[PDB]
Design an enzyme around this catalytic site. Structure first.
Site, PDB file in Angstrom:
ATOM      1  N   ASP A 141      -3.072   5.880   0.293  1.00  0.00           N
ATOM      2  CA  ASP A 141      -4.281   5.068   1.083  1.00  0.00           C
ATOM      3  C   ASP A 141      -4.586   4.552   1.785  1.00  0.00           C
ATOM      4  O   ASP A 141      -4.888   4.107   2.639  1.00  0.00           O
ATOM      5  CB  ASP A 141      -3.558   3.775  -0.123  1.00  0.00           C
ATOM      6  CG  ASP A 141      -3.467   3.720  -1.498  1.00  0.00           C
ATOM      7  OD1 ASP A 141      -4.327   4.567  -2.166  1.00  0.00           O
ATOM      8  OD2 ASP A 141      -4.056   2.217  -2.212  1.00  0.00           O
ATOM      9  N   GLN A 142      -3.246   4.744   3.090  1.00  0.00           N
ATOM     10  CA  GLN A 142      -3.053   4.465   4.667  1.00  0.00           C
ATOM     11  C   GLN A 142      -3.732   5.749   5.162  1.00  0.00           C
ATOM     12  O   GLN A 142      -3.887   4.974   6.154  1.00  0.00           O
ATOM     13  CB  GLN A 142      -1.587   4.612   4.694  1.00  0.00           C
ATOM     14  CG  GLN A 142      -1.210   4.803   6.404  1.00  0.00           C
ATOM     15  CD  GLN A 142      -1.395   6.199   6.881  1.00  0.00           C
ATOM     16  OE1 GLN A 142      -1.904   7.285   6.304  1.00  0.00           O
ATOM     17  NE2 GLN A 142      -0.745   6.196   8.243  1.00  0.00           N
ATOM     18  N   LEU A 158       0.057  -1.664  -0.369  1.00  0.00           N
ATOM     19  CA  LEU A 158       0.015  -0.058  -0.213  1.00  0.00           C
ATOM     20  C   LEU A 158       0.758   1.340  -0.418  1.00  0.00           C
ATOM     21  O   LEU A 158       2.069   1.354   0.054  1.00  0.00           O
ATOM     22  CB  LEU A 158      -0.688   0.089   0.996  1.00  0.00           C
ATOM     23  CG  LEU A 158      -1.578  -1.392   0.837  1.00  0.00           C
ATOM     24  CD1 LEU A 158      -2.903  -1.048   2.898  1.00  0.00           C
ATOM     25  CD2 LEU A 158      -2.507  -1.182  -0.046  1.00  0.00           C
ATOM     26  N   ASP A 159       0.065   2.506   0.288  1.00  0.00           N
ATOM     27  CA  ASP A 159       0.960   3.985  -0.200  1.00  0.00           C
ATOM     28  C   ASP A 159       0.494   4.747   0.704  1.00  0.00           C
ATOM     29  O   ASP A 159      -0.408   4.193   1.851  1.00  0.00           O
ATOM     30  CB  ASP A 159       0.931   4.329  -1.564  1.00  0.00           C
ATOM     31  CG  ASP A 159      -1.043   3.607  -2.451  1.00  0.00           C
ATOM     32  OD1 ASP A 159      -1.140   3.278  -2.078  1.00  0.00           O
ATOM     33  OD2 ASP A 159      -1.616   5.084  -2.706  1.00  0.00           O
ATOM     34  N   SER A 160       0.809   5.802   1.765  1.00  0.00           N
ATOM     35  CA  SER A 160       0.748   6.851   2.383  1.00  0.00           C
ATOM     36  C   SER A 160      -0.573   6.920   2.038  1.00  0.00           C
ATOM     37  O   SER A 160      -1.549   7.249   2.989  1.00  0.00           O
ATOM     38  CB  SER A 160       2.137   7.939   2.705  1.00  0.00           C
ATOM     39  OG  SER A 160       2.091   8.568   1.200  1.00  0.00           O
TER      40      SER A 160
END
Ligand SMILES: CCCCCCCCCCCCCCCCCC(=O)OC[C@H](COP(=O)(O)OCCN)OC(=O)CCCCCCCCCCCCCCCCC
Ligand SMILES: C[C@H](CCC(=O)O)[C@H]1CC[C@H]2[C@@H]3[C@H](O)C[C@@H]4C[C@H](O)CC[C@]4(C)[C@H]3C[C@H](O)[C@]12C
Ligand SMILES: *C(=O)CCCCCCCCCCCCC
Lengths: 120, 459, 88, 171, 128, 547, 173, 156
Positions: free
Chosen positions: C46-47, C42-44
């Site tokens: 997305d986070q 995942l990505d920030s």
């Protein structure tokens, strides 16, 4: 306010001024006016313990309303009919209030035509 | 009036001959006891005052101030012993002795039958105060405020001495009872205008008066709790006493000379109240707050209305009880954080429940909550101004507002707030601390039950 | 309000069940200690969405500074457990 | 400081909440939320630092006249309904000392362990001083971050109050 | 459109519209770091006393004392013949006083004559 | 007589007996919270025995039971004025208090100082009753301050919350300002007149009473939260809901109007007071609703929702309706206070959530709460035969059928429909729509105690307002005759508010983006009166103090 | 309040109507009223008599002091404390008595206003008009003096007032 | 027990003196500057921003989060008046002048319109509520000795 509108938006003179009303002679062509009696004299009003505003011609009916009410305790639905006698008598006065005004309204409107021809 | 003077004196051997550890108790026990006998002075009469001899006498007005002073000595001792516990034995006797003399001069002052004798004692009363404030002061910043007390003598006492002497030569006597009957109409002249200033400027500074108040904020900032109480509870009240009595002979000249004085207060009240909201000190905030209430009295005396005098008497009483308690209440925190800063400690209701109860209690009557005497007098005076002038209500209204604004703020800032995290010596309230406040608040309300005892002489 | 108790074991799925409705994750691959960026791919950005759901889920804001570092479900549990002082 | 890259997020999450209160309804919220995220994804791939630097001025100049007239705020967070409402009841721990004996007699067991809690608050204190003097740059410590304890039995310095800080609900 | 808010004493600007902070260069990086370390050292210096069991008392803040100390400004600054503030500043403290001098005086002078002529109502007035 | 007077004074002293038990003794802890409630329960009964005698006999008794003070030609006493208002306003206040009494015994279970909580709730009740029964300005003044002070603590119960400290002083600041007119009024009646006993004040019938009445006008400006000194009344909603239910919804807020009514003989002749008071309510009665059309705080909205009702009461007095306005006092209190309690039910199940936009799906998930919410609203909006309609139809009679300012009648109806507008916006989010509260469900109201509290306060609005009308004896000439539209204009515009708001409410469902509007923010941001007058004015007084 | 005379305190009679009930339900107030005689009044009277009886066995009285008239200020000399003092106290006491007469009269007005109620305006011509008489005399004698009232001042005001009307009266003729 | 040199003093008229003052309160020389030299006499104290406490972030774990003041930081000359309780200068929601002028509109609008309605109020077109007995002259207490002008409102 039709009456409010017609007075100022229409000619102002025709409508009698509500604060100064009445403003014309009582006998301006109005003969043989029967007097308005008072059933309850000064004594009865004094002992009735009623607000002066609550005291008027129709108030002589108003005395009947509470007389039953005091004995009506504890219940309250026993003197209903007597109320309409005063209220309807009050109802008549409001119409009279309306009728009292018109005699002042008519004279101002009628007098305009008489004076209009007096100088036309 | 001797029955209260000698036993007051007798405390001195008791303060000295007593044992080492019973020095506090012995004076405390009798000092409280003497005040009980003080209550006897309430045997007033409707038409005549009480004239014991040629050296002392107490009318209706005098007694309530007398009771407060005698009632106030034991309370001053109670607070004192905490900070004096470390002091050596001999000095404590020295300090305690000054109070006994300070009470002696005061009780003789208000009861004096002869004005000069009052003038003499008036000067004497200062001497114990200066030692107490100076000898056991709370600061070492050398403010060099002597000029104010030099100004006091120059613009105050010394002129008063000459006028008093001049009156005796002209009128023929300075016994207030004689003055009641030999008072003469003081017509208008430049000399009399100078005489008028001699009879009043002396008392104005002590009240104090707005503009002339510079010593009071710095007097409390240094005076210890023992010294502070008498200053605001008694010493400030000396001026009104003489002003009420002395004004017996200044009419009609006072009818126009009062305006510069009246304007100083009328506007002075608001100025002091606002600055308190800006003050950064529990004691200093009370200082100007003290000037606020005292300003109301000045107006009452000058206009000399039957209601003004009645209201003035309670204002001195209630304020004396009020401020005195406030100092003790404020000095309760000083016993922990050893500071006068108001923002250094906050949210103390979290740790001193019963302490906050006094804080809320005292503050309530500070802003003249009804029906307390704080308001009976203050509300008495407000009405009197209306007959003198209807416009005055604007300033009184504003003053009451702001006086209501800062009074609750000080309570709000300290008790109603979050505790200081780093402070770690907020010990539980001691019996002495709570006891001291209780003796103040309680009688203050009780007199509200019976107002006929501090209504003044006009009642 | 009677008692709104909080238990770590009960809270366990509350943080994780929030992930159980995500449309960018395979539920089975996900683990209690799985790092979002690497383990979950995942990505920030997305986070960010996951962190927001916890505020609607539990009802209490999250600081911007500390929201980022909560890349592990245990850490998110620690933030919820530690902030409310829940220990059992 | 904090860089503009992170400054992007500070409007990403905040802008939603005002939009959230505006959306009100759930189906509206997700749909409109998708509208906003779609706009973000218009420039999310934009990697130009000058433009990315310049693609944030208008956004802040755009949001001001879209901000909620009465924006929603969470209860426990600052400005909320339960904003410190119970701080008036929370009580400091250090006041435990001044407890009266008879009062302490009600909880003999709990106070027994505290003496050990304070015990390591005292004995561990000395080495905790040195524990920072190897991670102590000259010119004042660069940041306020703290290290753990690199041994067994001790604890990271500057910990006492937070660990002993009262609980959320005193009652 | 979106007329930028006029910065005012009672309305601080929003944080994400000041042009200063959008670009963070050495001219800002240097200053930012120095304050944190300076702030950190204070925290570290204060952190010892706060978390040291030995202390039983109230920290003597040096910042607080100066803030309180500066408030009690009595004679040290200021010059007597400084026309900029002495004349005008003195007005704020003596100006309005005279204004009240006529306000109440005029009414009382006004009021007295009416009583001397009965032009004011007092028939049911006693409290005075 | 003896029985009537004697049994009447018991309530004031009876209510104070529990208070005397808090400062003394330690006989029975853990039972005081019920102790106080039963006293009101008992007090209500002793507050209904005077009700029977008064209606039958109309015995307005002024009892002077002490000689407190005496100045030259003055005398103060701890007297009471047993008359129409005390006999008819006391029963309602206890009835509402009785409902709130058991409401608070449950909500505040989270407060260790619950016993302290009641140490002040019973205090305020005492002061308010003494105020209304007071025969003299001074004693009346005492209550004017007791409500002021008792509010201070109750407003700021959670002293930690900065909102409480700021709001509590904000109201105190305003509350004190109102007293300026009060103290002025005493001065005038002391200078021109010579006493503070209403017997002499009314009988002498002052010929130039502009100044004393002007002070009365100011008295109600801040105490009752009229415009110009209004903002504080909403500010009270930063604290306990039960506290707001009684003080700022039913008991303290009624002080401003009450004084004007209590001085009815003087207020009649001087129309200068009437116009400004008539206009004062006019600006407030809409400014409250105009602001309230888009406010988004459940408790504050209710405060604004209460504000408009209060704002209109001044108009009712402004139209010279002494005893008809009095009814609006009791009638409004019942449901609005119940609405506070109902808002308590919402907040309870919501677990400390208050945004109106975070509520919904409560018609069946909150069956009992939904039950009484409509009645108060419908009664509030003027549903026929309900508690609020009687005043709403009656009050609009004279204003629209008697000499009144042209603009005064303008805002009179514009806001009247707005009264129902926010109610629909409330019941919509409150009850209509699917749930919008946080994920976890804390919804539970199977609490018998509250049901007793809701039971007692649900009934009164439905029936008590109807009952109250019958017994009260004639005191005025009702204006039963008037044009049908004027008699029914309320019956015409009433349904418009629901529909017009319903027109506004439902069109927002559609998935269409929103657009800012200045007026949408001018009313939402409270007309900027608080947002501005509560920054510069503190800055003026304080920033300029040092110089 | 042992026995207060009614001449000073006028009181028009109370004429309580004899009820004439006409409803077909029992009067509710009667149930409580009888309990008042047995459960309130007599127990309020039963303890009283037990209290009263002892006071009949133990008796003692007190008087009402009477101050003989003394020479007035017009009989005093300038700068003479003896004579002036005797007049000042007399003037003070008598004036202090005159203070109450305003309050006693005020108390009558408080009677004609509440007992009569809605008949206030026509039923208080004697009280309201007699109220003014007290105001006129009291106001003239001891008003505008200031705080320090004294027989010399009041005599001066009476000397002020008598001379004032002297010129006007002769002005007419 | 605090040094003389570390306390507020005269106005520093040269940068060299200014070096201590900035250092004295832990303000870097750039952020520091005092009031203009005049009779105001506010000393070598700095000129901090005219801002309230609520503006400062609360999320930071201050020594005194209540005040949002950290130990060692300087204090605004009137920081007491800028505390959370007192005046707040946080960013406002709507334009300053318009916000003030938004108040001006509605309030100024209503006052005059009343006076407009005062000249032409609203009422009903009906006569007086007639009363007997000389228009209630005697009921209003009118003196019995001097009879009023006769009043008889005739029927119609
Ligand atoms: C400096 C000189 C002060 C003026 C003193 C003076 O001129 O007094 C003159 C007057 C002498 O006249 P004498 O024979 O005593 O009696 C007949 C009076 N027509 O003396 C008198 O008759 C009365 C003297 C009374 C004592 C005068 C006190 C001198 C101080 C007066 C000014 C006080 C100002 C206070 C400060 C105010 C600051 C605002
Ligand atoms: C005299 C009696 C003491 C009885 C005992 O020995 O416990 C006193 C002490 C405790 C008091 C009671 C408690 O305060 C509470 C009781 C229960 C309800 O609250 C009604 C009042 C209530 C009935 C009180 C009546 C009376 O005042 C009591 C009963
Ligand atoms: C003004 O207050 C009411 C506005 C409506 C005026 C009515 C005009 C049309 C009907 C007039 C004739 C019937 C009489 C009501």
């Amino acid at each position: 306010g039709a009456h409010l509108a017609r007075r100022y938006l229409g000619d102002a003179s025709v409508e009698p001024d509500p604060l100064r009303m009445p403003t014309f002679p009582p006998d301006y062509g109005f003969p043989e006016r029967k007097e308005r009696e008072m059933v309850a004299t000064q004594q009865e009003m004094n002992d009735a313990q009623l607000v002066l505003q609550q005291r008027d011609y129709c108030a002589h009916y108003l005395i009947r309303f509470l007389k039953c009410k005091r004995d009506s305790f504890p219940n309250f639905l026993a003197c209903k009919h007597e109320r309409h006698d005063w209220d309807y008598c009050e109802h008549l006065d409001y119409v009279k209030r309306m009728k009292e005004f018109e005699r002042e309204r008519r004279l101002l409107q009628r007098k305009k035509r008489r004076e209009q021809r007096e100088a036309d | 009036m001797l029955k209260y003077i000698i036993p007051t004196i007798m405390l001195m051997p008791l303060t000295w001959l007593s044992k080492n550890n019973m020095i506090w108790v012995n004076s405390t026990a009798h000092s409280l006891l003497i005040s009980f006998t003080s209550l006897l002075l309430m045997n007033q009469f409707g038409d005549n005052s009480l004239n014991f001899s040629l050296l002392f006498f107490s009318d209706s007005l005098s007694t309530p101030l007398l009771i407060l002073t005698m009632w106030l000595l034991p309370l001053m001792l109670m607070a004192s012993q905490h900070h004096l516990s470390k002091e050596n034995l001999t000095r404590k006797k020295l300090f305690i002795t000054m109070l006994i003399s300070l009470q002696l001069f005061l009780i003789m002052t208000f009861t004096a039958m002869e004005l000069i004798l009052f003038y003499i004692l008036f000067e004497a009363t200062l001497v114990p105060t200066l030692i107490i404030i100076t000898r056991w002061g709370n600061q070492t910043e050398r403010l060099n405020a002597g000029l104010y007390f030099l100004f006091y003598t120059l613009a105050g006492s010394l002129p008063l001495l000459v006028a008093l002497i001049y009156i005796q030569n002209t009128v023929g006597s300075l016994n207030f009872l004689m003055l009641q009957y030999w008072v003469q109409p003081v017509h208008n002249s430049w000399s009399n205008v100078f005489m008028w200033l001699a009879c009043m400027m002396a008392f104005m500074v002590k009240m104090p008066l707005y503009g002339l108040h510079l010593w009071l904020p710095k007097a409390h900032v240094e005076a210890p709790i023992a010294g502070s109480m008498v200053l605001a509870a008694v010493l400030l009240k000396l001026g009104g006493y003489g002003m009420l009595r002395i004004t017996l002979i200044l009419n009609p000249m006072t009818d126009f000379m009062a305006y510069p004085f009246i304007m100083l207060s009328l506007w002075g009240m608001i100025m002091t109240s606002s600055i308190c909201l800006r003050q950064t000190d529990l004691k200093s905030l009370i200082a100007y707050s003290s000037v606020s209430h005292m300003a109301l009295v000045i107006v009452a005396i000058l206009i000399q209305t039957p209601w003004s005098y009645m209201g003035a008497t309670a204002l001195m009483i209630a304020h004396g009880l009020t401020s005195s308690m406030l100092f003790c209440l404020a000095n309760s925190n000083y016993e922990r954080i050893h500071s006068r800063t108001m923002i250094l400690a906050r949210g103390l209701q979290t740790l001193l429940p019963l302490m906050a109860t006094w804080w809320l209690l005292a503050s309530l009557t500070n802003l003249a909550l009804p029906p307390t005497i704080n308001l009976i007098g203050e509300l008495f005076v407000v009405m009197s101004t209306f007959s003198w002038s209807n416009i005055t209500i604007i300033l009184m209204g504003v003053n009451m507002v702001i006086t209501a604004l800062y009074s609750l703020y000080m309570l709000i800032m300290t008790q109603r707030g979050k505790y200081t995290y780093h402070i770690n010596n907020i010990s539980p309230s001691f019996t002495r601390e709570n006891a001291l406040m209780s003796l103040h608040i309680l009688p203050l309300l009780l007199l509200t039950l019976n107002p006929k005892i501090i209504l003044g002489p006009l009642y | 309000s009677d008692a709104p108790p909080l238990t770590l074991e009960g809270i366990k799925d509350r943080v994780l069940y929030v992930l159980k409705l995500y449309d960018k994750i395979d539920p089975e691959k996900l683990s209690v200690n799985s790092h979002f960026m690497k383990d979950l791919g995942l990505d920030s950005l997305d986070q960010v969405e996951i962190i927001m759901a916890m505020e609607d889920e539990f009802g209490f804001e999250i600081p911007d500074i500390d929201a980022e570092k909560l890349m592990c479900p245990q850490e998110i549990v620690d933030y919820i457990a530690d902030k409310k002082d829940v220990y059992e | 400081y904090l860089t503009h890259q992170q400054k992007v997020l500070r409007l990403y999450k905040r802008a939603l909440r005002h939009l959230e209160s505006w959306c009100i309804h759930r189906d509206k919220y997700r749909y409109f939320a998708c509208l906003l995220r779609a706009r973000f994804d218009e420039h999310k791939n934009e990697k130009d630092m000058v433009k990315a630097t310049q693609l944030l001025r208008e956004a802040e100049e755009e949001f001001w006249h879209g901000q909620h007239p009465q924006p929603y705020i969470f209860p426990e967070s600052p400005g909320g309904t339960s904003y410190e409402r119970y701080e008036c009841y929370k009580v400091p721990e250090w006041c435990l000392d001044d407890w009266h004996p008879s009062e302490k007699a009600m909880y003999p067991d709990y106070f027994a362990k505290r003496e050990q809690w304070k015990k390591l608050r005292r004995e561990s204190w000395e080495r905790e001083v040195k524990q920072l003097q190897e991670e102590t740059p000259v010119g004042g410590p660069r940041t306020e971050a703290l290290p753990p304890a690199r041994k067994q039995g001790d604890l990271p310095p500057l910990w006492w109050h937070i660990v002993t800080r009262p609980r959320e609900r005193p009652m | 459109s979106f007329p930028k808010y006029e910065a005012s004493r009672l309305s601080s600007l929003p944080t994400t519209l000041d042009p200063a902070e959008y670009d963070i260069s050495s001219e800002t990086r240097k200053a930012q770091a120095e304050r944190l370390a300076i702030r950190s050292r204070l925290k570290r210096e204060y952190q010892l006393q706060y978390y040291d069991p030995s202390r039983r008392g109230v920290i003597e803040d040096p910042a607080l004392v100066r803030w309180t100390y500066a408030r009690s400004a009595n004679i040290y600054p200021n010059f007597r013949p400084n026309t900029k503030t002495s004349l005008l500043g003195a007005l704020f403290g003596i100006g309005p006083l005279v204004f009240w001098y006529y306000v109440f005086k005029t009414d009382r002078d006004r009021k007295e004559k009416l009583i001397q002529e009965g032009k004011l109502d007092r028939t049911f007035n006693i409290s005075y | 007589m003896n029985m009537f007077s004697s049994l009447s004074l018991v309530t004031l002293l009876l209510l104070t007996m529990p208070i005397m038990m808090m400062s003394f003794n330690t006989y029975k802890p853990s039972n005081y919270p019920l102790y106080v409630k039963t006293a009101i329960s008992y007090a209500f009964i002793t507050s209904m025995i005077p009700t029977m005698m008064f209606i039958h006999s109309g015995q307005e008794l002024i009892i002077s039971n002490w000689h407190w003070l005496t100045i030259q030609t003055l005398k103060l006493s701890l007297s009471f004025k047993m008359d129409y208002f005390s006999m008819m306003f006391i029963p309602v206040a206890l009835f509402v208090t009785w409902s709130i009494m058991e409401f608070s015994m449950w909500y505040m279970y989270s407060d260790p100082n619950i016993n302290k909580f009641f140490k002040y709730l019973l205090l305020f009740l005492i002061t308010m009753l003494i105020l209304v029964t007071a025969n003299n300005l001074f004693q009346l003044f005492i209550g004017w301050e007791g409500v002021g002070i008792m509010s201070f603590l109750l407003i700021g119960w959670w002293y930690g919350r900065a909102d409480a400290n700021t709001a509590a002083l904000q109201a105190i600041l305003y509350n004190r300002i109102g007293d300026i007119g009060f103290i002025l009024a005493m001065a005038w009646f002391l200078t021109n007149l010579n006493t503070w006993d209403l017997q002499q004040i009314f009988m002498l019938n002052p010929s130039d009473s502009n100044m004393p009445l002007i002070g009365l006008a100011l008295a109600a400006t801040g105490k009752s939260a009229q415009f110009g000194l209004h903002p504080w009344l909403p500010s009270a909603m930063e604290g306990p809901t039960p506290v707001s239910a009684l003080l700022h919804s039913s008991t303290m807020v009624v002080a401003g109007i009450f004084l004007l009514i209590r001085f009815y003989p003087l207020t009649e002749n001087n129309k200068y007071i009437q116009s400004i008071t008539l206009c004062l309510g006019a600006i407030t009665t809409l400014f409250t609703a105009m602001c309230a059309l888009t406010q988004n705080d459940i408790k504050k909205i209710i405060a604004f929702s209460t504000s408009s009702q209060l704002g209109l009461m001044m108009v009712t007095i402004g139209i010279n309706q002494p005893y008809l306005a009095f009814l609006h006092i009791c009638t409004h209190a019942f449901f609005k206070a119940m609405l506070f309690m109902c808002s308590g039910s919402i907040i309870h199940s919501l677990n400390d959530e208050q945004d109106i936009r975070k509520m919904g799906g409560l018609f069946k998930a909150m069956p009992f709460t939904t039950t009484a919410l409509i009645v108060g609203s419908l009664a509030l909006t003027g549903m026929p035969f309900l508690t609020g309609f009687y005043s709403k139809d009656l009050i609009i009679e004279a204003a629209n059928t008697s000499y009144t300012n042209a603009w005064a009648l303008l805002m009179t109806l514009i806001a009247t429909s707005f009264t129902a507008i926010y109610s629909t916006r409330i019941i919509f989010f409150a009850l209509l729509g699917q749930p919008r509260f946080p994920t976890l469900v804390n919804i539970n109201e199977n609490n018998p105690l509250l049901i007793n509290s809701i039971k007692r306060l649900l009934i009164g609005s439905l029936f008590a307002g109807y009952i109250i009308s019958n017994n009260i004896p004639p005191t005025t000439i009702p204006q039963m005759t008037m044009p049908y539209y004027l008699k029914t204009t309320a019956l015409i515009v009433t349904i418009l508010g629901f529909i017009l708001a319903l027109e506004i409410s439902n069109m927002t469902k559609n998935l269409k983006y929103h657009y800012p509007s200045n007026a949408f923010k001018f009313s939402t941001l409270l007309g900027y009166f608080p947002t501005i007058m509560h920054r510069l004015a503190p800055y003026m007084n304080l920033s300029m103090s040092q110089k | 309040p042992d026995s207060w005379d009614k001449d000073v305190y006028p009181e028009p009679p109370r004429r309580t109507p004899a009820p004439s009930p006409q409803t077909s339900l029992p009067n509710p107030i009667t149930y409580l009223t009888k309990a008042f005689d047995l459960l309130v009044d007599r127990p309020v009277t039963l303890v009283r008599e037990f209290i009263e009886r002892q006071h009949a066995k133990n008796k003692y009285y007190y008087y009402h002091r009477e101050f003989r008239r003394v020479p007035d200020i017009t009989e005093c000399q300038e700068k003479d404390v003896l004579c002036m003092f005797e007049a000042e106290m007399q003037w003070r006491r008598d004036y202090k008595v005159d203070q109450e007469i305003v309050n006693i009269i005020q108390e009558r007005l408080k009677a004609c206003q509440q007992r009569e109620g809605e008949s206030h305006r026509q039923n208080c011509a004697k009280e309201l008009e007699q109220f003014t008489q007290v105001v006129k005399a009291y106001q003239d004698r001891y008003h505008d003096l200031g705080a320090h009232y004294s027989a010399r001042k009041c005599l001066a005001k009476q000397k002020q007032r008598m001379l004032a009307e002297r010129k006007a009266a002769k002005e007419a003729a | 027990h605090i040094t003389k040199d570390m306390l507020p003093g005269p106005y520093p008229k040269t940068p060299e003196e200014r070096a201590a003052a900035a250092k004295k309160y832990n303000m870097r020389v750039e952020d520091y500057e005092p009031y203009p030299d005049d009779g105001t006499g506010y000393g070598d104290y700095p000129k901090l921003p005219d801002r309230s406490q609520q503006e400062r972030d609360p999320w930071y774990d201050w020594d005194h989060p209540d005040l949002r003041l950290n130990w060692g930081e300087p204090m605004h000359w009137d920081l007491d008046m800028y505390i959370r309780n007192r005046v707040d200068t946080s960013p406002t929601p709507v334009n300053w002048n318009l916000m003030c002028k938004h108040l001006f509109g509605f309030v100024a609008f209503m006052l005059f319109m009343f006076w407009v309605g005062e000249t032409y109020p609203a009422y009903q077109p009906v006569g007086p509520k007639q009363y007997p007995y000389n228009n209630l002259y005697l009921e209003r207490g009118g003196d019995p000795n001097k009879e009023p002008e006769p009043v008889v409102h005739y029927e119609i």
